[PDB]
Amino acid sequence: VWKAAAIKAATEYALTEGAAKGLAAGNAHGMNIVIYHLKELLIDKLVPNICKTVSSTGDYTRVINFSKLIIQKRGAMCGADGGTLSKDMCTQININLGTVLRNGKANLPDKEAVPKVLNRLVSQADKAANEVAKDTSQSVAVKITEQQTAAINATYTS
Amino acid sequence: DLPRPSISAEPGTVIPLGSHVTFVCRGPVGVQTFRLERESRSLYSDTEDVSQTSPSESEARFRIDSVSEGNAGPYRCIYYKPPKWSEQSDYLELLVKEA
């Protein structure tokens, strides 16, 4: 009447549930920080519909796509024409995009700079999301594995 | 290492209000991106649309359609040829006549 079969099935169901919860929790933390940095880097000012336009898609890796759009919007609002944002606005926006470099000099031509920094932002989210993903997956699995073997010991008593 | 750019204006440096203007950066060949700067920390335009004017120099152009009063003053320019940028060209002053 050996309980090995039930514990194998309890732990297998344990692993698959814990991987799932850890994925959902993982690449949902990872969008939380992408949405946090886009607001921090003033990109929100370049395109006002960006926090939702990226979140409503799931998959935070997809912000890479908005590169050409930011480049366009950056030149249109902080161009040589005189621009539509404040000069101090544009000073920081250029700094954050890594395009004009805090001490005054030129960093990168804007075509390299925008794709670079949000490739940096996705790589910085992947480590955090994989971190949350394996904490949550282990936390959930050992929690539901112990309750299930506790109930499987409780069941063989009767 | 890299030569200094040059900035000129077409038709010229004195433009009636409402007219148009085109700034013309020039540097060597093989240039990736030209950048026109008005207040270099904040306001600038960037273009990879570079055309070759001679065997040893290329150039790019930036155009303002309706010239405003706030368009007058400094402009200068600089180009990127990986891995480094150039130094910054001499200034150009755009003046804007009301009539």
**CB distance from A2 to chain B under 8 Å?**
no
> Is the CB of A111 less than 8 angstroms away from the CB of B33?
yes
Instruction: Report strand pairing: B33-38 vs B73-81.
Output: antiparallel
Torsion angle of alpha carbons A142, A143, A149, A150, nearest 10°? 140
Neighbouring C-beta atoms of residue A68, cutoff 10 Å: 11
Provide the residue range defining the domain that includes A22.
4-157
Three-class SS state of B81? strand
Q: Which two tokens stand for residue B69?
A: 């009063």
- As separate numbers, helices (DSSP H) first and strands (DSSP E) second, chain B gives 0, 10
Reading the block at residue A76, the tokens are: 């249109």
Number of domains in chain A: 1
**CA–CA dist A44, A96 (Å, integer):** 12
Backbone angles phi, psi at B90, to 5 degrees: -65, 160
B70: chain A residues, CB-CB within 8 Å: 82
Q: How was this structure obtained? A: X-ray
Q: How many whole angstroms separate alpha carbon B88 and alpha carbon B65?
A: 25
Domain hosting residue B55, numbered range: 1-99
Subunit contact A91:B64, Cβ cutoff 8 A? no
C-beta atoms surrounding B9 within 10 Å? 16
**Residues 68 through 97 of chain B touching chain A, CB cutoff 8 Å:** 68, 70-71, 75, 78, 80, 85
- B28 HSE (CA, 13 A, CB side): 13
Q: Does B40 touch chain A (CB under 8 A)?
A: yes
Domain count, chain B: 1
CB B80 within 8 A of CB A110: no
Rounded Cα distance between B87 and B28, Å, is: 13
CA B56 to chain centroid: 19
Residue B61 DSSP symbol: E
